[PDB]
Motif scaffolding. Structure first.
Motif, PDB file in Angstrom:
ATOM      1  N   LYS B   3       0.736  -1.091   0.092  1.00  0.00           N
ATOM      2  CA  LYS B   3       0.129  -0.289  -0.020  1.00  0.00           C
ATOM      3  C   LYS B   3       0.965   1.296  -0.011  1.00  0.00           C
ATOM      4  O   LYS B   3       0.556   2.298  -0.541  1.00  0.00           O
ATOM      5  CB  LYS B   3      -1.021  -0.054   1.125  1.00  0.00           C
ATOM      6  N   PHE B   4       1.900   1.269   0.515  1.00  0.00           N
ATOM      7  CA  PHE B   4       2.787   2.297   0.762  1.00  0.00           C
ATOM      8  C   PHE B   4       4.278   2.203   0.278  1.00  0.00           C
ATOM      9  O   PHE B   4       4.647   0.761   0.302  1.00  0.00           O
ATOM     10  CB  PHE B   4       2.916   2.956   2.076  1.00  0.00           C
ATOM     11  N   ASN B  11      12.983  10.962   0.289  1.00  0.00           N
ATOM     12  CA  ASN B  11      12.166  11.265   1.430  1.00  0.00           C
ATOM     13  C   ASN B  11      10.619  11.455   1.051  1.00  0.00           C
ATOM     14  O   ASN B  11      10.207  12.527   1.468  1.00  0.00           O
ATOM     15  CB  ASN B  11      12.545  12.505   2.488  1.00  0.00           C
ATOM     16  N   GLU B  12      10.325  10.682   0.358  1.00  0.00           N
ATOM     17  CA  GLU B  12       8.856  10.739  -0.203  1.00  0.00           C
ATOM     18  C   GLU B  12       8.072   9.531  -0.010  1.00  0.00           C
ATOM     19  O   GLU B  12       8.737   8.566  -0.257  1.00  0.00           O
ATOM     20  CB  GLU B  12       8.643  11.210  -1.530  1.00  0.00           C
ATOM     21  N   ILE B  13       6.961   9.652   0.517  1.00  0.00           N
ATOM     22  CA  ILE B  13       5.884   8.294   0.707  1.00  0.00           C
ATOM     23  C   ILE B  13       4.937   8.285  -0.572  1.00  0.00           C
ATOM     24  O   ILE B  13       4.490   9.310  -0.608  1.00  0.00           O
ATOM     25  CB  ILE B  13       5.473   8.284   2.236  1.00  0.00           C
ATOM     26  N   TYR B  14       5.000   7.214  -1.217  1.00  0.00           N
ATOM     27  CA  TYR B  14       4.067   6.994  -2.217  1.00  0.00           C
ATOM     28  C   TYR B  14       3.161   6.034  -1.878  1.00  0.00           C
ATOM     29  O   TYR B  14       3.552   5.063  -1.189  1.00  0.00           O
ATOM     30  CB  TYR B  14       4.813   6.638  -3.429  1.00  0.00           C
ATOM     31  N   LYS B  15       1.885   6.269  -1.756  1.00  0.00           N
ATOM     32  CA  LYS B  15       0.563   5.511  -1.649  1.00  0.00           C
ATOM     33  C   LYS B  15       0.067   4.843  -2.955  1.00  0.00           C
ATOM     34  O   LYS B  15       0.152   5.572  -3.897  1.00  0.00           O
ATOM     35  CB  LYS B  15      -0.303   6.290  -0.513  1.00  0.00           C
ATOM     36  N   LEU B  24       0.904   7.118  -5.989  1.00  0.00           N
ATOM     37  CA  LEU B  24       0.991   8.514  -6.064  1.00  0.00           C
ATOM     38  C   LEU B  24       1.611   9.100  -4.962  1.00  0.00           C
ATOM     39  O   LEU B  24       1.591   8.295  -3.882  1.00  0.00           O
ATOM     40  CB  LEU B  24      -0.561   8.957  -6.131  1.00  0.00           C
ATOM     41  N   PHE B  25       1.861  10.512  -4.920  1.00  0.00           N
ATOM     42  CA  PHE B  25       2.746  10.955  -3.720  1.00  0.00           C
ATOM     43  C   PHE B  25       1.618  11.274  -2.531  1.00  0.00           C
ATOM     44  O   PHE B  25       0.611  11.878  -2.871  1.00  0.00           O
ATOM     45  CB  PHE B  25       3.026  12.354  -4.238  1.00  0.00           C
ATOM     46  N   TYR B  26       2.124  10.773  -1.623  1.00  0.00           N
ATOM     47  CA  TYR B  26       1.300  10.871  -0.308  1.00  0.00           C
ATOM     48  C   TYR B  26       1.739  11.777   0.606  1.00  0.00           C
ATOM     49  O   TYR B  26       1.063  13.066   0.878  1.00  0.00           O
ATOM     50  CB  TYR B  26       1.083   9.338   0.468  1.00  0.00           C
ATOM     51  N   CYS B  27       2.923  11.878   1.327  1.00  0.00           N
ATOM     52  CA  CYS B  27       3.533  12.767   2.088  1.00  0.00           C
ATOM     53  C   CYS B  27       5.167  12.645   2.013  1.00  0.00           C
ATOM     54  O   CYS B  27       5.548  11.780   1.363  1.00  0.00           O
ATOM     55  CB  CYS B  27       2.921  12.581   3.450  1.00  0.00           C
ATOM     56  N   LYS B  28       5.653  13.555   2.820  1.00  0.00           N
ATOM     57  CA  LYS B  28       7.175  13.323   2.973  1.00  0.00           C
ATOM     58  C   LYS B  28       7.340  12.564   4.141  1.00  0.00           C
ATOM     59  O   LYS B  28       6.514  12.070   4.894  1.00  0.00           O
ATOM     60  CB  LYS B  28       7.640  14.833   2.936  1.00  0.00           C
ATOM     61  N   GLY B  29       8.673  12.212   4.319  1.00  0.00           N
ATOM     62  CA  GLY B  29       9.161  11.287   5.293  1.00  0.00           C
ATOM     63  C   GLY B  29       9.851   9.983   4.871  1.00  0.00           C
ATOM     64  O   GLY B  29       9.838   9.915   3.631  1.00  0.00           O
TER      65      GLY B  29
END
Lengths: 427, 45, 335, 306, 330, 45
Positions: B3-4, B11-15, B24-29
């Motif tokens: 899922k992620f 430093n990007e989380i893709y969901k 797609l781009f979810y958040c940073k981290g």
């Protein structure tokens, strides 16, 4: 059940009180230990406690939460059960009565003396019932035991003629034939204490805290938990809450009122579409309540038939609710602002003609009013059904099964009712 | 199907999104935000 | 023997509403029905210590350590817009009527004695000294509490409202009508007879009071401030909260009512203050001192007992004050 | 009780400081007993003169605003108070917390009697409106709509219709008029059957606990919130006897000495805020008075609802 | 015995407004009624570590590890436009008058003594020294706090506003008038006489103060800053309605900056009139109560035991009464 | 460094906050509420 064990128990309580006073006394001179051992140690302690009863009272309904300069009467009365079903209050407390105490704060030793569970029951409960081990431990001869028993019983009896102050509330009630009953209500401290205890174990109880943490872990807990939003806190004693009641020290004020609010208690303001993008975004114009409500429409995908009867009933009343708040949003826009005919353009999705009911007839006499009364624009139901068709998931098995058929027939019934209420806008 | 997806150097989380077959781009981290999002939402869709 | 009734309660006559404040430009006051509302907004204040020190905080090391740590709030503030110099404060007022009849009375003998005393007063001298002072406190915009002390020009418009429309319109220059002299005028006396016919009649007389004040562009207006105990725990919160009904600053109705009751010029202490509010044991909150003490025979309760029970009718000023308390309302009664 | 011969609609009435403290357990909207006592005060003050019997009341509440404030860092709320005067020494008096709220309700009050045929409908409608302009509804003054755009007038709908279609037609006309609000009805049968199902779940359950379960947003493990049918609220459904009924001139410091007094205690039922076009019969949704004085049980409800 | 009253509250005389800042070009300052506002917008910042290390952080590996993870913020910033070089700060100021009369007083004897004290002050000398310094702090644009410190030219236009229109207009070069010398001028004395007649209660004075600071194209302006309880939002600026502004109390603190009589040196210059006269930037309280020169000892010696201070100290005392506050004990 | 500061004439209790170097508004009240808060929380941070 032996008087000697009761006697050594009450003498233990008296000497515990004495060592407490001498420990919190910090004395080094003046020989106050002699007066403390003469007054707060012997059987004279029972005599001054039997004197100090008459300041205290065991109550369930006191007056002091209503304006505290009210010297009225307070009641230890448990009402009978209503024969009519439904409604209830404070007659549910059979064994869970907490029995609030009013009176002076100096004479609490009588209450903490009488409240003991020495053998297996309450000392007042053993003293009210005439028995053998009663009337003998707090005595050496019979007649002082008699007068001390009639002293220690009277903490549950009212004092003086029945009276409620001018600061107390007194409200007429129309009787069915004629005449009135004056109905002075009292604050139920026992019922408030029980609901306060229930809400305290519901919010700060560890069995609730564990399920609250397991919701964050997203694991399965055995039981659930509650939240109680929109509580209001009402304090009774201003800075000295002890002067009201005994149970007003456990809850320091803090009535913890439950919310009884109409659903329009959060004021939502009006917003009419102006531009093309405003006509795109404000055609549906959807509040958080309808998104919360259609989130539950999306959570009704699976169904077993014995549950699906009640689930289809829930979906029926749910689509009735979404029709209700659609008509509600249309009504509050149509009466609130003239913003539907504020500024013209090319894009307002003008085929609606329901959000501008007085904006087309009260201004244009024959231009738009005769263009709306003969046309009767009520066509918003099928566009609303197209918008509501998104609420179910676009699954091939959901459309192949008969659940889509049940969905469409109940949706058709509710859009028919929306049609029937939307058509009669010219009267 | 996960899922992620953390893009590690950037430093990007893709969901994962199911409509288009892609992430797609979810958040940073980084790994901590990825593990915290896995604990909240559950992996493997 | 005719003892005092144990439950006495008079309903509040002269019932005002919440004074909504909105803002616009002077010399278009007649088009002030679409003036935008004065809104209550937040701003951060940061101050040094200015209080008196308790003689153990006067060490200059302790003082210089204290003033390096300022004290931060977030107050509510209400200002006019930067292109609007006039504050329009607009409330309604119901003059109810039946001013002597109590809402609760125990002894029917005391009730008939009180009704006879009140009707003796009204037939003797009606509500013409009281309604003149109520018309003054409507006329000079005393209900503009701090929004009046630096205004260039205050104008008060009072409209008697019949079934759906204006029956009679007044217009006053509220700065010319002083805050301490209850003088005479033709329009003021017409308003006084209207409030007299309100207080004497059975039905209510409704007035719409509008007050404009030139304060200045963007200047600060002062709506009513909210009394909230339990400001909060362990966080940072608001120190000063302003009243606002529907995203629109407002004065509380009881503050407008305290401004309207400011008619009592007859208290035995000297009138360095001027008129105060009509209260039993007449106690000015800002002064912190209660005039008309029961040590003298000049509070409300002892004057009412001497007037009703033992028929010792006081001076006409003091019975003006007593009937002003009866119009004011209150909950009286002993144990 | 008896059915209304007509259905008067008092329009949107603004109440500025109503009692937001309904009961010792509930805050928010004022108790329905305030509205039923208000309608009986209206009957006491003009109904004896127009030879009509104003009875029952439908509560709509177009808008509501409690004078509350959520403190910083708390989920709960507190009440904005007033500053009472000082005592005779200048000390601040002990603060007694009263809730205040700004309401905009409209009252569907049922009227029946021989005065309907004697006077025009608009005449008695204007009479009770001019009387209710000088009254108060829950401790709060009734704001009388001066110098706005247009005053909201009355319409006394005659409940006797020439047809079922004419009855539904002018009923729909009235329901369109009181449409931006939310009608409040008494739902005690749902509370009773919720007591039965909860007692089936775990025994010796009180309907105090069933009421509390119907109020709270309780969570269920697989997490899902419990669905609730409609806007279910707790209301004070009248009073229950704590004392024997005293004689008129017997209790000390009563309101009057010609009325029997009895010390009582609230009874917390359940109510449901629903949109007014759900009921399809506005002859219902009226709050009446049910005393039964020999037992106690002075209570109000909406009979003939379902 | 005449002790101090248990309540005293003096209202704030010299009420300013929120000073709205807008922006345009110099030499068309006379057509500056339609200048667009300075809007507060956001931007991102990266900081390295720059504070002192507490000798436990002085591990070199720990320092490089703290440097490799920088702190991200999102600050509110207000700039001039790239085609505008002049910041117009506009506010209005009400000089009220009736300076010595408190808004609240328990003790009527103390109230009469304090009114007699202020009355013999005003009769011995008007509000003439104080209004000279208040007109200076209007004239040199001190209320431009950090927007003034690097400006090429500052110009202040002070319009006395009668009924609807400008009764009398002033125009000053705010850099010729220093920030530390209270000298004389014709126009400064005219404005001082206007503020004096305002403070004496002998007229209604409402000024419209407009100040133009010629900064430079696109430069940073400094509106007042609010309190906040990666996107940390470390800075929030004050803006009334999408238009940057200075708080009214900041303009008020800059107007009160008249105290040049404190017992320390005069190399620092005027500070704001405060009880225990304190500058929070210098962290130091001048007029400490160890000396007999704060507001409270001066007022309690002037009013109670009739010990009238020096003439400049009673200028300071009456400036504190113009400032406002609650004096008196619990 | 004192944890609470009573502003005496204005009946406000200011509690020291360590994040920003300043005092923030805690509650209303005078010397009694200040002493009671000192007894509950302890002064000097």
């Amino acid at each position: 059940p032996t008087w000697q064990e009761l006697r050594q128990f009450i003498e233990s309580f008296i000497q515990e009180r004495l060592q407490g006073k001498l420990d919190k006394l910090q004395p080094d001179e003046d020989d106050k230990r002699q007066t403390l051992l003469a007054t707060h140690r012997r059987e004279a302690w029972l005599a001054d406690a039997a004197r100090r009863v008459g300041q205290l009272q065991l109550v369930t309904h006191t007056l002091k939460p209503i304006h505290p300069d009210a010297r009225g009467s307070n009641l230890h009365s448990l009402p009978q059960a209503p024969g009519q079903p439904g409604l209830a209050g404070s007659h549910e407390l059979g064994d869970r009565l907490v029995s609030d105490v009013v009176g002076n704060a100096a004479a609490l030793d009588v209450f903490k003396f009488l409240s003991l569970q020495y053998q297996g029951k309450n000392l007042l409960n053993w003293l009210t019932e005439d028995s053998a081990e009663a009337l003998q431990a707090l005595s050496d001869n019979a007649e002082q035991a008699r007068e001390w028993r009639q002293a220690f019983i009277g903490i549950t009896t009212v004092k003086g003629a029945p009276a409620s102050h001018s600061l107390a509330k007194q409200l007429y009630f129309p009787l069915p034939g004629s005449g009135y009953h004056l109905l002075a209500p009292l604050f139920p401290t026992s019922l408030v204490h029980h609901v306060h205890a229930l809400l305290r174990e519901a919010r700060f109880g560890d069995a609730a805290k564990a399920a609250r943490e397991a919701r964050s872990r997203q694991e399965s807990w055995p039981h659930g938990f509650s939240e109680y939003p929109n509580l209001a806190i009402q304090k009774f004693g201003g800075t000295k809450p002890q002067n009201i009641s005994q149970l007003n020290n456990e809850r320091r004020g803090e009535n913890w009122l439950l919310p009884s609010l109409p659903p329009n208690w959060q004021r939502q303001n009006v917003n009419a579409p102006m531009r093309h993008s405003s006509v795109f975004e404000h055609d549906f114009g959807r509040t958080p309540e309808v998104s919360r409500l259609t989130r539950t429409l999306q959570r009704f995908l699976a169904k077993t038939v014995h549950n699906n009867l009640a689930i289809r009933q829930r979906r029926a009343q749910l689509v009735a609710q979404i029709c209700d708040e659609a008509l509600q949003y249309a009504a509050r826009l149509r009466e609130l602002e003239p913003g539907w005919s504020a500024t013209p353009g090319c894009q307002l999705h003008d085929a609606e003609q329901l959000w501008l009911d007085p904006l087309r007839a009260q201004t244009d006499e024959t231009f738009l009013q005769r263009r709306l009364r003969g046309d009767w624009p009520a066509e918003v139901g099928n566009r609303f059904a197209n918008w509501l068709n998104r609420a179910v998931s676009s699954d091939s098995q959901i459309l192949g099964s008969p659940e889509a058929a049940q969905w469409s027939q109940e949706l058709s019934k509710e859009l028919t009712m929306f049609k029937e209420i939307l058509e009669d806008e010219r009267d | 199907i996960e899922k992620f997806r953390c893009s590690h150097g950037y430093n990007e989380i893709y969901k994962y999104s199911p409509d288009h077959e892609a992430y797609l781009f979810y958040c940073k981290g980084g790994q901590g935000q990825l593990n915290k999002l896995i604990a909240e939402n559950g992996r493997f869709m | 023997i005719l003892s005092t009734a144990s439950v006495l309660a008079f309903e509040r006559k002269l019932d005002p509403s919440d004074a909504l404040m909105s803002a616009g430009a002077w010399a278009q006051r007649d088009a002030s029905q679409e003036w935008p509302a004065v809104t209550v907004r937040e701003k951060s204040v940061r101050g040094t210590i200015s209080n008196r020190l308790k003689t153990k905080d006067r060490d200059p090391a302790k003082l210089d350590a204290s003033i390096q740590s300022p004290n931060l709030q977030t107050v509510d503030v209400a200002n006019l817009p930067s292109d609007a110099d006039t504050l329009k404060v607009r409330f309604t007022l119901r003059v109810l009527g039946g001013a002597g009849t109590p809402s609760a009375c125990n002894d029917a003998a005391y009730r008939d004695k009180l009704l006879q005393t009140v009707a003796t007063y009204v037939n003797d001298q009606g509500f013409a000294e009281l309604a003149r002072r109520y018309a003054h406190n409507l006329a000079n915009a005393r209900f503009l509490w701090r929004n009046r002390v630096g205004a260039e020009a205050v104008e008060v418009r009072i409209n008697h409202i019949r079934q759906g429309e204006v029956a009679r319109a007044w217009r006053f220059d509220a700065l010319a009508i002083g805050l301490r002299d209850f003088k005479a005028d033709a329009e003021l006396d017409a308003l006084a007879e209207l409030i007299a016919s309100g207080l004497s009649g059975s039905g209510h007389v409704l007035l719409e009071v509008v007050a404009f004040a030139r304060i200045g562009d963007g200047q600060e207006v002062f709506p009513s401030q909210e009394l909230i105990l339990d400001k909060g725990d362990k966080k940072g919160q608001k120190s000063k909260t302003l009243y606002s009904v529907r995203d629109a600053a407002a004065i509380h109705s009881q503050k407008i009512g305290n401004a309207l009751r400011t008619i009592d010029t007859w208290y035995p202490d000297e009138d360095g203050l001027g008129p105060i509010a009509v209260e039993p044991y007449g106690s000015v909150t800002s002064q912190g001192k209660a005039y008309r003490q029961p040590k003298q025979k000049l509070d409300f309760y002892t004057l009412l007992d001497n007037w009703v029970l033992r028929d010792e009718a006081p001076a006409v000023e003091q019975q003006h004050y007593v009937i002003a308390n009866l119009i004011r309302g209150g909950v009286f009664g002993e144990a | 009780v008896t059915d209304p011969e007509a259905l008067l609609l008092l329009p949107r009435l603004s109440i500025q400081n109503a009692n937001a403290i309904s009961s010792p357990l509930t805050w928010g909207f004022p108790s329905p007993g305030a509205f039923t006592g208000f309608v009986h005060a209206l009957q006491r003050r003009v109904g004896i003169s127009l030879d009509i019997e104003l009875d029952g009341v439908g509560i709509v509440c177009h808008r509501f605003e409690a004078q509350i404030s959520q403190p910083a860092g708390k989920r709960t709320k507190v009440f904005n108070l007033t500053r009472n005067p000082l005592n005779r020494d200048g000390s601040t008096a002990a603060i007694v917390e009263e809730g205040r709220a700004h309401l905009e309700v409209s009252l569907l009050l049922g009227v029946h009697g021989d005065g309907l045929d004697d006077h025009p409908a608009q005449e008695i409608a204007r009479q009770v409106q001019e009387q209710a302009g000088a009254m108060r509804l829950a401790g709060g003054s009734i704001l009388p709509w001066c110098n706005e755009r247009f005053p909201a007038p009355n319409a006394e709908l005659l409940m006797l219709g020439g047809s079922d279609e004419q009855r539904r037609k002018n009923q729909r006309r009235l329901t369109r008029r009181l449409l931006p609000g939310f009608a409040l009805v008494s739902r005690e049968a749902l509370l009773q059957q919720h007591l039965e199902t909860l007692r089936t779940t775990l025994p010796e359950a009180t309907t105090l606990d069933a009421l509390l379960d119907l109020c709270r947003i309780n969570f269920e493990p697989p997490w899902q919130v419990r669905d609730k049918p409609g806007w279910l609220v707790p209301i004070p459904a009248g009073y229950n006897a704590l004392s024997p009924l005293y004689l008129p001139g017997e209790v000390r410091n009563a309101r009057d000495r010609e009325t029997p007094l009895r010390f009582v205690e609230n009874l917390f039922g359940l109510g449901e805020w629903l949109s007014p076009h759900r009921v399809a019969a506005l002859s219902d949704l009226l709050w009446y008075h049910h005393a039964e004085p020999d037992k106690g049980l002075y209570r109000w409800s909406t009979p003939r609802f379902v």
